[PDB]
Design a protein around this ligand. Sequence first.
Ligand SMILES: O=C(O)c1cc(F)ccc1Nc1cccc(Cl)c1-c1ccccc1
Length: 136
Amino acid sequence: RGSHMCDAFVGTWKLVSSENFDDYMKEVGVGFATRKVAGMAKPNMIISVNGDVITIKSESTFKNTEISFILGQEFDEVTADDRKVKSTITLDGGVLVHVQKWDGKSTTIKRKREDDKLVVECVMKGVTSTRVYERA
Ligand SMILES: O=C(O)c1cc(F)ccc1Nc1cccc(Cl)c1-c1ccccc1
């Protein structure tokens, strides 16, 4: 089994900057106490690929979470803020596009490589948050 373009995401990443994330969590519907505690967190993101299966882990003082998935195939996810969502992740021109649907709501998380960084864009309606990660 050979290399894949998405191996560019593989590695250990740490959060280095965040913008508008509190507003993004508000639009998602995250309650007060969770927003305050989660807004303080500096998560590590650990991405690995094994065959068709991509695994993304998030570790922080707030919560430790993990998702494993195959591109284009819907799965059940319990988010860090305790939402139970249906998720589908696909590869669009080098960008991992992650859509979560729940309670009639929808949010989109994009992960992309920019220079030596992994840039995350969290979009909920008209509210966007940027989370920038660097190699740990
Ligand atoms: O935290 C990131 O950067 C991130 C990146 C992603 F690609 C996808 C999700 C992310 N985090 C969250 C999304 C919604 C709600 C919450 Cl509470 C979190 C969250 C906050 C603090 C610690 C752990 C998780």
